[PDB]
Amino acid sequence: ANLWERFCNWVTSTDNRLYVGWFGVIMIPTLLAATICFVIAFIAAPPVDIDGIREPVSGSLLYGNNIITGAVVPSSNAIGLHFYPIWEAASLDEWLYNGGPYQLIIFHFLLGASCYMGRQWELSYRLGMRPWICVAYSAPLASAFAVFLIYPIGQGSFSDGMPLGISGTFNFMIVFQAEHNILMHPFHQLGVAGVFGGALFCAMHGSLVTSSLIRETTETESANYGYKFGQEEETYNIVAAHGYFGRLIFQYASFNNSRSLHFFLAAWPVVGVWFTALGISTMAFNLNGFNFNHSVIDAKGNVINTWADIINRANLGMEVMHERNAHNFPLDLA
């Protein structure tokens, strides 16, 4: 056909080693830009005045960091939610000072990962698959939106978005506990249930299927040689697996339907991680974890502490120390 119809045929081709697709056409450049900026900044960027108090924090390896302490540092609190592209700055010198690379990385990354999700829908359509893998991916993606975009929005600043580094991430967690008591938030609790459960059922499923592989290999060769790519027969015996698990707990506590079993494997961590994302996205608007501080009172009115109150004492330590030069007035309101 015409040049365009050939292009369309290529973009959407089921035969490319890596699927491109229309989402891919946005995904490829945005992810490349984010990746490249990230790598260069992580290695070489100068210190960033994250809290807009002229107190530049060093993130990069060349400026005295290791893999663990290193980061791409959030953009200046003096910027807030203003859009700070490279052309808004008088120079790259200024751009680097104010944390411009962070906005560039997280914006291209979020667009790219959103397209990564669209691309998963797309390929499954091209391949005649059912379409919901992309929905499972919406859970980590939502979590990434929570810490890089929604939280900044609620709090009025990208300086409060998660830093793009290991120790930075911990800083974000700790300040978050001080300001929102995230541990006492039931959406975070559902998140824990989601990831602890996800790990558990992973270990379980892995182990139940493995324990049930049909004898196909010699006593010396890997059992993996007992399964061939594309074979039509199922490589393990699900009835034996159920016979084991149904007896481990009780019969009806166990799955004999592979389809409902794999559904539960998809649903449990995905829903729990949705709640995690929504925990962060709703504490973005300062609806916080349960507060039982001084909840138990004695007959006279003496406060009888609980474990909630010892949590409070730790949160207070975080609160008063964090960003030790940034507050001038008595309440931290964002």
């Binding site: 005649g128 709703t282 349960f290 001038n328 309440l331």
Partner: protein, 202 residues
């Protein structure tokens, strides 16, 4: 359904930001102060207090070297200092009387602050939209006493959750609708498996 789900998710998200930032169609008199507004009210409250005490608020240098009460935005406008620097885009009827062409006006700050402005700023500072899920108002380390969560937090949080699940609903139904229109929503035909008819990748 899926198209409508997508448009509702989008609208939910817009609604979340509307109630969070906007104080015209969500008047702070009824809905409580915005987060930015309450943060701006705190700096105004202490500026008032301290200047009453004799402080020259324009030339008071804070620990970092930036002005304790007043400083410049990145484009030069006079704005409140401390953390609330981020909130300098806030505009509110108790505050605009002090704003001149260059931002907050030091002449007006020194002479023209009316009692009703002090009152509203104290009110808004102390009704910031922060509180716990069990409706203890305050920071997360606050003791029980005040039963408050701003209507703004309830409206933003609820609608972020709703907009979010609607987006999922959109992906679910869009993807299911595509598959059902093409005829493979119930699974792969074992005897016409598309991948088996394609060249191998490598």
């Amino acid at each position: 359904l899926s198209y409508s789900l997508g448009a509702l998710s989008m609208m939910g998200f817009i609604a979340t930001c509307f109630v969070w930032f906007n104080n015209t169609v969500y008047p702070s008199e009824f809905y409580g102060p915005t987060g930015p507004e309450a943060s701006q009210a705190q700096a105004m409250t202490f500026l008032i207090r301290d200047q009453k005490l004799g402080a020259n608020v324009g030339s008071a240098q804070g620990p970092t070297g930036l002005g304790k009460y007043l400083m410049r935005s990145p484009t030069g406008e006079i704005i409140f200092g401390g953390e609330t620097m981020r909130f300098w885009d806030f505009r509110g009827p108790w505050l605009e009387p002090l704003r001149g062409p260059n931002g907050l006006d030091l002449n007006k700050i020194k002479n023209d602050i009316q009692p009703w402005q002090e009152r509203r700023a104290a009110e808004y500072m102390t009704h910031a939209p922060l509180g716990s899920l069990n409706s203890v108002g305050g920071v997360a380390t606050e003791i029980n006493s005040v039963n408050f969560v701003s209507p703004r937090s309830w409206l933003a949080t609820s609608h972020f959750v709703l907009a979010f699940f609607f987006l999922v609903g959109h992906l679910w139904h869009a993807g299911r609708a595509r598959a059902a229109a093409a005829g493979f929503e119930k699974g792969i035909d074992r005897e016409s498996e598309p991948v088996l008819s394609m060249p191998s990748l490598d």
